[PDB]
From a paper:
Regarding enzyme classification, [name] belongs to the ARTC family with an R-S-E motif (R65, S97, and E220), with R65 and E220 being catalytically essential residues.
Therefore, we expressed and purified the selenomethionine-substituted CteC36–276 (SeMet-CteC36–276), crystallized it in complex with NAD+, and determined its structure at 1.87 Å via single-wavelength anomalous diffraction (SAD) phasing. The NAD+-bound SeMet-CteC36–276 crystallized in P21 21 21 space group, with three copies in one asymmetric unit. The [name] structure harbors two domains, a core mART domain with NAD+ bound and a small helical insertion domain with no apparent interaction with NAD+. The insertion domain in [name] is a small four-helical bundle present between β4 and β5, spanning from residue F157 to R194. Within the mART domain, every atom of NAD+ can be unambiguously placed in its binding pocket based on the electron density in all three copies in the asymmetric unit. Overall, NAD+ binds [name] in a bent conformation via multiple interactions. Specifically, the adenine base is primarily positioned by the π–cation interaction with the guanidinium group of the R93 side chain, with additional interactions with W95 carbonyl oxygen and R65 side chain via N6 and N7 atoms, respectively.
Numbering used by the authors: 38 to 276
Amino acid sequence: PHEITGGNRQEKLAQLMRQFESGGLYLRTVSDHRDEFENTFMPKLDACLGHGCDERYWSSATFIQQGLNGKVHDPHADRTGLIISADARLGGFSTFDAATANVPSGLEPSQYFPGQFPKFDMMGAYQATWNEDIFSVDATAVSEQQMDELGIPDEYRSVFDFDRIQEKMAQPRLAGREVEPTEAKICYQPKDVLGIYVDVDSPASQSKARELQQAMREQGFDLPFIAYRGGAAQELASV
Ligand SMILES: NC(=O)c1ccc[n+]([C@@H]2O[C@H](COP(=O)([O-])OP(=O)(O)OC[C@H]3O[C@@H](n4cnc5c(N)ncnc54)[C@H](O)[C@@H]3O)[C@@H](O)[C@H]2O)c1
Ligand SMILES: [Ca+2]
């Protein structure tokens, strides 16, 4: 089952640190860890084994990387989450938290993204150009040259190659200034789950993280606890 789990706890820890100090990786926070386990992770495991479908397929995550002072999405400071391998499938990346939702009812999920991922952020581009015509185009459907004709600055264009997210985030990373949560749509597989996110200041976060980690162990996925904040990712032995 090692081909499905992706390694033991020590191998996953070493994997996520290596990625964190290289090109980065992903962090998906979750308000309902029971739902994430039961309705996202477990269907993905069943599909890996040949049973069900990965119906949800695409999930939101933030890009994290050593030295990048990046916030995660946790408005009430009460979330746990998953540290997710850079090898998860990328459906699109934006530096803005915009309106891009999950796969809607009745839409085919596996290729909903990148096709329906906005190729640029309309709100940011409009504030920067005051170009009315931005709202007369389908942002999911424009090409590079249409974006040029609209005058869309590159700062507002989405990224579709993982290796290129770190180039996008290079200037914020160097300045050390806190950046708002960025957002990627990713399709993670069970083997891509490398760690459990813990906010060490939050009793809610730790209680939820302990339950999620125990639930994952029952399926043979033994994950390290990872305290991420402010461009540092550090292990917690327990809790
Ligand atoms: N979660 C992150 O790390 C992250 C990162 C960047 C931006 N955001 C933004 O935060 C807001 C909340 O997003 P979120 O990811 O916390 O919630 P979500 O959309 O992933 O899940 C919300 C709720 O819907 C269900 N759900 C979970 N995954 C689902 C899926 N794939 N399809 C359908 N239903 C699903 C569960 O009940 C869950 O509690 C959104 O605006 C999002 O763009 C979140
Ligand atoms: Ca959003």
